[PDB]
Amino acid sequence: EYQNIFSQVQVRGPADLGMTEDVNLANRSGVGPFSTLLGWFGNAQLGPIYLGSLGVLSLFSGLMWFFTIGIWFWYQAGWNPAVFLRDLFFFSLEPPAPEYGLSFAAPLKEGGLWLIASFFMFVAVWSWWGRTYLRAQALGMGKHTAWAFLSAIWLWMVLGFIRPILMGSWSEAVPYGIFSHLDWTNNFSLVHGNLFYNPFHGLSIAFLYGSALLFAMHGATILAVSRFGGERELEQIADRGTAAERAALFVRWTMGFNATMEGIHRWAIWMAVLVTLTGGIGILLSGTVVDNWYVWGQNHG
Amino acid sequence: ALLSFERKYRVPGGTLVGGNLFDFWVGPFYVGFFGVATFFFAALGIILIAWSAVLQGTWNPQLISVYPPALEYGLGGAPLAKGGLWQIITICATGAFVSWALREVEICRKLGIGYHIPFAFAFAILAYLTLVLFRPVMMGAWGYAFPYGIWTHLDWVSNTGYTYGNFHYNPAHMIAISFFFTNALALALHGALVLSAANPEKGKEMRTPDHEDTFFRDLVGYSIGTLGIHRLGLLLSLSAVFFSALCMIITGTIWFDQWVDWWQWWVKLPWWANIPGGING
Amino acid sequence: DLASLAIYSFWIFLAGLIYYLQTENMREGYPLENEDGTPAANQGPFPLPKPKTFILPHGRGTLTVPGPESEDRPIALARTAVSEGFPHAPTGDPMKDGVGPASWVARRDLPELDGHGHNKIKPMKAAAGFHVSAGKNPIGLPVRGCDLEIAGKVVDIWVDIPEQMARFLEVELKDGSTRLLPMQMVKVQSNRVHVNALSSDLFAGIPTIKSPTEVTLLEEDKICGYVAGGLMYAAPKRK
Ligand code: BCL
Ligand code: BCL
Ligand code: BCL
Ligand SMILES: CC[C@H]1c2cc3[nH]c4c(c3C)C(=O)[C@H](C(=O)OC)c4c3nc(cc4[nH]c(cc(n2)[C@@H]1C)c(C(C)=O)c4C)[C@@H](C)[C@@H]3CCC(=O)OC/C=C(\C)CCC[C@H](C)CCC[C@H](C)CCCC(C)C
Ligand SMILES: COC(C)(C)C/C=C/C(C)=C/C=C/C(C)=C/C=C/C(C)=C/C=C\C=C(C)\C=C\C=C(/C)CC/C=C(\C)CCC=C(C)C
Ligand SMILES: CCCCCCCCCCCC[N+](C)(C)[O-]
Ligand SMILES: CCCCCCCCCCCC[N+](C)(C)[O-]
Ligand SMILES: CCCCCCCCCCCC[N+](C)(C)[O-]
Ligand SMILES: [Cl-]
Ligand SMILES: [Fe+3]
């Protein structure tokens, strides 16, 4: 009894250069190699990639962020490669101290290098967002991917930009460090009277747990009905087959729910985007409107 | 009542137990033997939670809490009022979960589909049994288990966590979080991609899986494919919960000190242990 | 205060969202029916959504859902009881009649096309230059049923051109005709292909395709249905 987690047989044909529509083909690369390793689980083909202006702006901008942090990590290691690898998780690029408020006037060694790195990260993410929109437009597709990605951008923007501004200093932002961003996260909860009492944090968690429940069920189901070509979801939407019927009936007989092949993808996008949506509201309201979620919770309001 | 297409699927057979005795529906819901077992175990467990509410002196759902036995009971039975009800309810909850899984198996057999869903669910049951059974038995008391109440179970998470310092430092917990974050990123993309193709720009024809593959190649230079994303989703979410169970089975058993101090294995490796400067020099 | 207003707004949003999601998932299979196929009195709490129209590519028209629902085929089933909610016994051979886990849907009797308007699925012999790139090449292997009898041999792989994957094995039977087997219902072993769903004597009964270089959505459903139904219906002959 074969389970369809790994392919039993790979087949390969000519490289697929992809659909054209209104795409500027001058800006697609050539195809990369074919990975047989990847091809046990999914597609074997690497490439082509599209790189126009926003692509290169984003890629350059994102490397500058990455290098700006790494230059500061080397500096902290005293330029010793042994100390760099030993302490990698412990280095941190900290924002400016509370004194300097929302000013760009802090020295490199006390928060200016943080601001530089953040500027590069700001350019990198927003250019990448325009890119998810334009790549969809060129192919005549809905902008679902761009609007879903904005949900993620919302929480990132709250954490590093919108909240620090409302609180009146960059000191409130997140440091670029593996262990240091973990400590910040734990510190944040303690200083705000325990996030478990933040109702938005509670919902955020419900949606995170639910994203795992839903992808577990959805993935499991499509594999369970792949013996009727179930993973061919678009043609099953246009022309319901026994795969869509059996998938619907599993859900109905189990827990009395209705699920269409299209409808389950609406559950999927929303379960996911509501994680960071509710999340960013919960963080935005912390220390701006609510000092202490315990105290708030006692009054309920 | 039936979906327009449902009658042809409502045939006899597929049951694991009882032959045709419980082989019927109540409205949309398939029953089967494990439907009856699930109802028995659920009703019994709800009765016992109400009994717990009486003894505690509150009907408020935001206050009702059923606590495990205290540590000095070890792995013995306990008086109902002081952890015995938690013990019977835990047997009931386990019976209801396993019955629900075997019922999904009966539904899979009648529909002639794979058993991937009940298999995926068995991982959630594993995680539950880790917290209430495997970890407590390894640690020597039921009292290390979590209480059944809306806010009290959150106190237990907070207290259990902060027993080991900042629980972020548990390395299995880092991996588990990564799979949870990645699962949700993948679910967002999968939903968005299928809907962007089925629901294109106004007045345009439905796109094809070719457009879906093309969009991802254009964006990031790789496309896992329509079979691959469903394999990936099942794996990310199952892995998240595997590493979750693992991060707690090792906490209190092989490791009972502060988790941050565990990371000194890396820092005190002999070749860089004594080199001055950096953070740890 | 602001936080109470935010959390209260949010629950009103979420309630609208859940309504929208529930009615979106009613676009197939409604209205609900009694077992006799007449419309049920109780259709549930939410009403049917306003129809939406998919424009299919390659000049294949439009779909409108919700829209008129019929099976468009006879169901060889009979009631086993005098009240709602019991199983319906097959009146013939459920494998032949296409009921239970052998069920098929009357999908379009055309093949699925790729983004260029070409057939999505072809025999590998007609797909230049597709080849097996990894794993055992099943072409030439004998095919064994669940009764451990040899039913035929593999003479081709039918591949998905755009997604580059094996979808069916074309199997030659003792009488020189062929059948498609779904790739997800066979074990490729080193020296044979094993099929658990079917016994050797049920291979001839696999529905045949009207053209030998393409398979239609209707044919895929009849084939996949038939092979899946063998798990239940060919259990007497499995070992
Ligand atoms: C998993 C690790 C921790 C844990 C850490 C947390 C943290 C942190 C949070 C929760 C929160 C929740 N936890 Mg918990 N929780 C644990 C184990 C459980 C178990 C169990 C194993 O039996 C259950 C039933 C719950 C249930 C719950 C919910 C009350 C709530 C949201 C869950 C959700 O949306 O999931 C996803 C599932 C779905 C979306 C499907 C729908 C499930 C529904 C909502 C479940 C209803 C349960 C009901 C209230 C319990 C009574 C049922 C009886 C039959 C009477 N937790 C363990 C001990 N849990 C959140 C909260 O806000 O509560 C205060 C929260 O922030
Ligand atoms: C001691 C710690 C506190 C706590 C403090 C916090 C704080 C502080 C926060 C959370 C937040 C969250 N907490 Mg908490 N939390 C606690 C305990 C828990 C428990 C539990 C006990 O079981 C759970 C399950 C959670 C779960 C969660 C999540 C639901 C939520 C984060 C969602 C998310 O996806 O962010 C991950 C997604 C993002 C951060 C968005 C990133 C998007 C950007 C644009 C990506 C850029 C990538 C960049 C360019 C780099 C490129 C990389 C390479 C190309 C690969 N917390 C305790 C009580 N928690 C967050 C939240 O929303 O709060 C309401 C948050 O800010
Ligand atoms: C202050 C607290 C500590 C902390 C202490 C702990 C402790 C303690 C635990 C975790 C655990 C987890 N932590 Mg932590 N954790 C912290 C911060 C975080 C942060 C963050 C952003 O800071 C994140 C993202 C996480 C994330 C996580 C997850 C990896 C994991 C919870 C998921 C899980 O186990 O599901 C597993 C799912 C279940 C158990 C649900 C099973 C459902 C059952 C089978 C069915 C229920 C049916 C129901 C009754 C039916 C309802 C009725 C119907 C409506 C009819 N933690 C902080 C630093 N964390 C937990 C873990 O790993 O557990 C194994 C755990 O015990
Ligand atoms: C493994 C990946 C994720 C996952 C997957 C998953 N869950 C699943 C499935 C799958 C594949 C199903 O097939 C099954 C289903 O049918 O979903 C609709 C299910 C399911 N997962 C559910 C919940 C759930 N899953 C969770 C988690 C996860 N499930 C993982 C993150 C959580 C979390 C994170 O907390 C919850 C709350 C249900 C909706 C359903 C299982 C329903 C079930 O078992 O019903 C039988 C039992 C009853 C009807 C109730 C009996 C009650 C007891 C007798 C008494 C109460 C005891 C309990 C301990 C009280 C504690 C409450 C307090 C903590 C507040
Ligand atoms: C080996 O050496 C080389 C040379 C290769 C370099 C190596 C580099 C290494 C090892 C780097 C490692 C980097 C790490 C570990 C980074 C980790 C980052 C983390 C964990 C980030 C977490 C959160 C970040 C957030 C929330 C940031 C938000 C940022 C913004 C919202 C942008 C805000 C913008 C600001 C403040 C400025 C805007 C300015 C104007 C004028 C508008
Ligand atoms: C998640 C992306 C990478 C996945 C790669 C996993 C490789 C699995 C190899 C399977 C071995 C082949 N076999 C024996 C199953 O036919
Ligand atoms: C998931 C990340 C995968 C990234 C792979 C990108 C492939 C790019 C192809 C490189 C070929 C370049 N060139 C110019 C020779 O065609
Ligand atoms: C996509 C919609 C799915 C519905 C999920 C709703 C889960 C309920 C969460 C209850 C937690 C409420 N709380 C305590 C944070 O206020
Ligand atoms: Cl695993
Ligand atoms: Fe899907």
Side-chain angles (χ1 to χ4, degrees), chain A residues 182 185-186 189 194 196 201 205 208-209, chain B residues 93 97 100 121 123-131 135 146 154 156-162 165-169 172-178 180-181 240-241 243-249:
Chain A
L182 293 183
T185 298
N186 172 67
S189 172
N194 185 2
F196 280 159
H201 181 256
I205 288 174
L208 186 70
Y209 291 171
Chain B
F97 300 162
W100 186 274
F121 179 46
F123 284 67
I125 299 182
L126 179 68
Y128 171 74
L129 284 183
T130 301
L131 298 186
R135 176 163 184 279
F146 72 86
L154 262 62
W156 178 92
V157 170
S158 213
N159 300 332
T160 299
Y162 283 118
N166 179 13
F167 207 75
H168 287 154
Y169 282 91
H173 186 266
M174 298 184 176
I175 293 159
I177 289 179
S178 301
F180 272 107
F181 283 176
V241 164
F243 281 102
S244 285
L246 192 61
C247 96
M248 292 296 305
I249 203 57

Side-chain angles (χ1 to χ4, degrees), chain B residues 1-5 7-14 23-25 109-110 112 198-199 203-206 208-210 226, chain C residues 29-30 32-33 35 40 52 54-55 57 69 71 77 79 85 87-88 99-101 103-104 114-115 162-163 228 232-233:
Chain B
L2 275 53
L3 298 176
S4 59
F5 54 76
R7 196 196 165 174
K8 69 179 174 290
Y9 295 107
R10 284 200 177 199
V11 293
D23 191 24
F24 64 84
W25 292 257
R109 275 151 73 80
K110 192 183 288 293
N199 302 279
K204 287 216 168 57
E205 302 159 330
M206 273 179 90
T208 59
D210 317 29
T226 74
Chain C
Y30 282 66
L32 298 184
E33 297 174 7
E35 307 186 344
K52 79 185 291 196
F54 294 101
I55 303 166
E69 288 276 21
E71 290 300 277
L77 286 185
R79 265 195 160 179
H88 302 89
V99 296
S103 286
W104 53 270
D114 68 20
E163 308 201 64
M232 185 170 280
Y233 293 127

